Amino acid sequence: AISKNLPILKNHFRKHWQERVKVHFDQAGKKVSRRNARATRAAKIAPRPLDLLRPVVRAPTVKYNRKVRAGRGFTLAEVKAAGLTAAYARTIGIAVDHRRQNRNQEIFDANVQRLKEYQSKIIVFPRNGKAPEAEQVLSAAATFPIAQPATDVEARAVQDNGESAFRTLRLARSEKKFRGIREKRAREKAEAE
Amino acid sequence: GAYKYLEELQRKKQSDVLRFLQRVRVWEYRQKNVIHRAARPTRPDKARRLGYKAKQGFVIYRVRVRRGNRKRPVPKGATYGKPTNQGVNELKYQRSLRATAEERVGRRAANLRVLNSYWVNQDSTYKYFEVILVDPQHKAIRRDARYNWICDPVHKHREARGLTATGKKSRGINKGHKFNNTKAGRRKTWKRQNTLSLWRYRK
Amino acid sequence: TVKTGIAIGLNKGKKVTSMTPAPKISYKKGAASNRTKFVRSLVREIAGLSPYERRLIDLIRNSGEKRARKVAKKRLGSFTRAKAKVEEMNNIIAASRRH
Amino acid sequence: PEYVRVQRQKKILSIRLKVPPTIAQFQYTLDRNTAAETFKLFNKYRPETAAEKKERLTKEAAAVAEGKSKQDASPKPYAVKYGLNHVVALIENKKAKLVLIANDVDPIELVVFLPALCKKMGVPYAIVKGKARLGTLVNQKTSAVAALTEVRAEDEAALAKLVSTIDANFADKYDEVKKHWGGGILGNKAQAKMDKRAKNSDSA
RNA sequence: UUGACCUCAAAUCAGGUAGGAGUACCCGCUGAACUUAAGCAUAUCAAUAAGCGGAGGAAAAGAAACCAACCGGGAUUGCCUUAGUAACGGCGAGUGAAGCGGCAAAAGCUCAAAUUUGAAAUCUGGUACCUUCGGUGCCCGAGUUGUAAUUUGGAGAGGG
RNA sequence: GUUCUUUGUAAAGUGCCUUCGAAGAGUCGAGUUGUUUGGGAAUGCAGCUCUAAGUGGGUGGUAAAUUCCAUCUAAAGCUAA
């Protein structure tokens, strides 16, 4: 059970792992049926891509707020900023994420740019039938890449205000820290009897 | 409106005509029979907004259901095992008693497809319920995709599965971290979260 | 709201330009109505205070509101949701029969 | 058999039991006089149906698609009115000019808001007995939820006559049965024999 | 006297449908033991065996009473990932995640809540005929305890 | 793709001001129980008791009280991959 220096290993195999198993022997296979759907989809879909219009939306957390992410649909605030309605914009080829909203104007911009380049490039035909075919471009998302909203510059001049930045955090943290107890003493000298 | 007068009404089941329905329908139940068929809605505000429509191919199943628990089958006071389980009359019933009724009228006439039941009278020996029946045979519902979906053999014995109100409820499957243990179909996520699946060039 | 720029503090982020949304009625979910208040008030007339209402109203006019606060506390469970039930009866007391 | 058993105890077991102020106001139904003229006067008010709907498409066949008649062609409907949600919302905005409250309705629950309505929205009503006799002169079934917001200038005379009769003999006796708890009427068994008990042990 | 009226039912029932099969895999319920702890009840085994209810090729999930704390994100599903960690457990043996990132694949919607009432106007069936998965002349009923028709939240409805 | 025919005082979308905007209860959560269970002073689920509301209400993973907010709309429904 335990003899000679080795790491204490937790290997969850006390049950019937030897019953509910699945080595992907269908890796290359289901991977090929994948590329097949692509071409079978096309024959049907006529000149419309394997995916529709997806946005540039920054990612959450203290770890992913660093760079943007391939967003979901498209809010109706960014929908009318383009010039059309959702019950008609989706029937075109643009996603509509109505449960979500936009709280920043800097990114709302990079996202309203994605709605202009895409719409000015959509040769749409009515219920005519003749429809002057103009082929199509493989993937819709791989055709309008990550325009990573302004990374700013990478070469400026020196600027020193002498705050240390290290104490601007030793105190920035002391700010949110004694907020409640420094208001405790500020509660006494708050009410004048 | 009118129906919303009864929407707020079918809320204060505590006095006058409401507390008076306690001393009237309690005996109405213990009178007709136990598991039976009715005619028109008893509470139009509920049924309707929950799925009732006054048109052909429409019937109702008012049913008497017993309360309490489900004492572990095992004869006398024998459980054949370790105490972790032992207990008998002190045993739950993971599915709601409400399902008990549906699953009965539901399989008395499986020619129909169970839409949903509604509560109306709790006592001591029982807890009563009623049912809104969608008929996958009369052209009255078989001419309206407003609720046409019901007739399809993919809806075979609705109630006895969990596609009703009490259903998604009595499945533990709802959106949110309140259900991370099973936000997926019970054994789907179970088999999944334990299954050891390996690659081609094992990483 | 606005941030400070500092990576921590009252706001550990970026002072990047905010913006305003549309009237999401999913922030308006708490709505009443001339059709509903008509009914909610017409309710206290078609049925009015029930057995539980008579019971607790006499609990305030007993030893106070703190006492009637632990009665509706033994009916709903939310000490705070109970404070709601308290002032609602004083609305049946003062507002209806008091003036 | 079992169908007379359950139905007889149904309303008669409801009489031993003390009926709430929401009920009891019943039995206090329409007097035999109102029924007489409310049948001879409402026999001139019958809504569109059968030959009436057919005679409508022939008159617009010589008007609408003839001398271009915009929505209007024949005289606006002047008879009796119907509708649960129709006559229900009618009183909620004074639109009603006559109220006839639903006597029966197995579920007296969807007609509970009819009475307290005319209350804080004053409108003359009379709980009339005949959800069937109502359906006969309205060519419907058993609804008893009738309305009359207008009439002709040859019959509106006897209208205001019974308008005050129903109002006083029903609407003004209502503000009275507000604190009234009816029911509790026993039968000959526990009654005449209940006399032999209290009459042979008290002041005899 | 005549006729309604709701419930009940009635019948080689006009006239319609239901059982069951298979049962790797899935959706419920169900339910341990052996085993492990070097003994052993809690645990573990395993919300698995067997048990019993029901489909369909997938059925279930499925548009938020979600995630988050960020510049936020954004249906479900499944996938590498998180991580055998934070954590549950004689905190003993062992049990056991999610949201993020990456990902294929991606999609949307419908009923009650209103007073249309200048209009029961709609839906089941029968029936001559017909271009017959139905249709119009003829005739009933459900339904007025809301079928039409307006109405679904990201909205959108009466007035003008 | 071509041919024989208007369902048309036809039907629906974004615009302006305005009056409005209902929004599902023996639920909700609370109580105690047992199972479940990473969910640990309830992870849901079920139990018998209790039975609301609308600047309200579910959530913000440590009980609880006050202060808003962040956050979303249950108690009704179809849906390929």
Curated annotation (Swiss-Prot), chain A:
The keyword Ribosomal protein appears for this protein: yes
Pfam family membership, one: Ribosomal_L13e
Modified residues (Phosphothreonine): 143, 151
Keywords: Cytoplasm, Phosphoprotein, Ribonucleoprotein, Ribosomal protein
GO cellular component: cytosol; cytosolic large ribosomal subunit
GO biological process: cytoplasmic translation
Intracellular or extracellular location(s): Cytoplasm
GO MF terms, alphabetically ordered: RNA binding; structural constituent of ribosome
Gene3D superfamilies tied to this protein: 1.20.5.110
Signal peptide range: none
Subunit and partners: Component of the large ribosomal subunit (LSU). Mature yeast ribosomes consist of a small (40S) and a large (60S) subunit. The 40S small subunit contains 1 molecule of ribosomal RNA (18S rRNA) and 33 different proteins (encoded by 57 genes). The large 60S subunit contains 3 rRNA molecules (25S, 5.8S and 5S rRNA) and 46 different proteins (encoded by 81 genes).
Family the UniProt entry places it in: Belongs to the eukaryotic ribosomal protein eL13 family.
Chain's role: Component of the ribosome, a large ribonucleoprotein complex responsible for the synthesis of proteins in the cell. The small ribosomal subunit (SSU) binds messenger RNAs (mRNAs) and translates the encoded message by selecting cognate aminoacyl-transfer RNA (tRNA) molecules. The large subunit (LSU) contains the ribosomal catalytic site termed the peptidyl transferase center (PTC), which catalyzes the formation of peptide bonds, thereby polymerizing the amino acids delivered by tRNAs into a polypeptide chain.
Note: Present with 133000 molecules/cell in log phase SD medium.
Name of the protein this chain belongs to: Large ribosomal subunit protein eL13A
From Swiss-Prot, chain B:
Compartments, record wording: Cytoplasm
Regions annotated as coiled coil: none
GO biological process, one term: cytoplasmic translation
Keywords from the UniProt entry: Cytoplasm, Ribonucleoprotein, Ribosomal protein
Gene Ontology cellular-component terms listed: cytosol; cytosolic large ribosomal subunit
Biased composition (Basic residues): 168-184
Cysteines joined through disulfide linkages: none
A UniProt-annotated Pfam family: Ribosomal_L15e
Signal peptide positions (record): none
Main location: cytoplasm
Residue span of region Disordered: 163-184
One function term, GO molecular function aspect: structural constituent of ribosome
Comment field (misc): There are 2 genes for eL15 in yeast.
Assembly, per entry: Component of the large ribosomal subunit (LSU). Mature yeast ribosomes consist of a small (40S) and a large (60S) subunit. The 40S small subunit contains 1 molecule of ribosomal RNA (18S rRNA) and 33 different proteins (encoded by 57 genes). The large 60S subunit contains 3 rRNA molecules (25S, 5.8S and 5S rRNA) and 46 different proteins (encoded by 81 genes).
Name recorded for this polypeptide: Large ribosomal subunit protein eL15A
Organism field: Saccharomyces cerevisiae (strain ATCC 204508 / S288c)
Upper taxonomic lineage: Eukaryota, Fungi, Dikarya, Ascomycota, Saccharomycotina
From Swiss-Prot, chain C:
Molecular function per GO: RNA binding; structural constituent of ribosome
GO CC annotation terms, alphabetical: cytosol; cytosolic large ribosomal subunit
InterPro entries for the chain: Ribosomal_eL36, Ribosomal_eL36_sf
Example of a GO biological process term: cytoplasmic translation
Keyword Ribonucleoprotein: yes
Keyword match Cytoplasm: yes
Alphabetic keyword roster: Acetylation, Cytoplasm, Ribonucleoprotein, Ribosomal protein
Protein family: Belongs to the eukaryotic ribosomal protein eL36 family.
Subunit structure: Component of the large ribosomal subunit (LSU). Mature yeast ribosomes consist of a small (40S) and a large (60S) subunit. The 40S small subunit contains 1 molecule of ribosomal RNA (18S rRNA) and 33 different proteins (encoded by 57 genes). The large 60S subunit contains 3 rRNA molecules (25S, 5.8S and 5S rRNA) and 46 different proteins (encoded by 81 genes).
Something else known: Present with 31600 molecules/cell in log phase SD medium. There are 2 genes for eL36 in yeast.
Database matches in PANTHER family: 60S RIBOSOMAL PROTEIN L36
Name recorded for this polypeptide: Large ribosomal subunit protein eL36A
Originating gene: RPL36A
Swiss-Prot record, chain D:
GO-annotated cellular components: cytosol; cytosolic large ribosomal subunit
Keyword annotations of the record: Cytoplasm, Ribonucleoprotein, Ribosomal protein
Major localization class: cytoplasm
GO biological process, one term: cytoplasmic translation
Protein location: Cytoplasm
Annotated GO MF terms: RNA binding; structural constituent of ribosome
Protein family according to the UniProt entry: Belongs to the eukaryotic ribosomal protein eL8 family.
Role, per record: Component of the ribosome, a large ribonucleoprotein complex responsible for the synthesis of proteins in the cell. The small ribosomal subunit (SSU) binds messenger RNAs (mRNAs) and translates the encoded message by selecting cognate aminoacyl-transfer RNA (tRNA) molecules. The large subunit (LSU) contains the ribosomal catalytic site termed the peptidyl transferase center (PTC), which catalyzes the formation of peptide bonds, thereby polymerizing the amino acids delivered by tRNAs into a polypeptide chain.
Further details from the record: Present with 238000 molecules/cell in log phase SD medium.
Subunit-structure text: Component of the large ribosomal subunit (LSU). Mature yeast ribosomes consist of a small (40S) and a large (60S) subunit. The 40S small subunit contains 1 molecule of ribosomal RNA (18S rRNA) and 33 different proteins (encoded by 57 genes). The large 60S subunit contains 3 rRNA molecules (25S, 5.8S and 5S rRNA) and 46 different proteins (encoded by 81 genes).
Record-given protein name: Large ribosomal subunit protein eL8A
Encoding gene, per UniProt annotation: RPL8A
Segment of the intact protein contained: 53 to 256 of 256
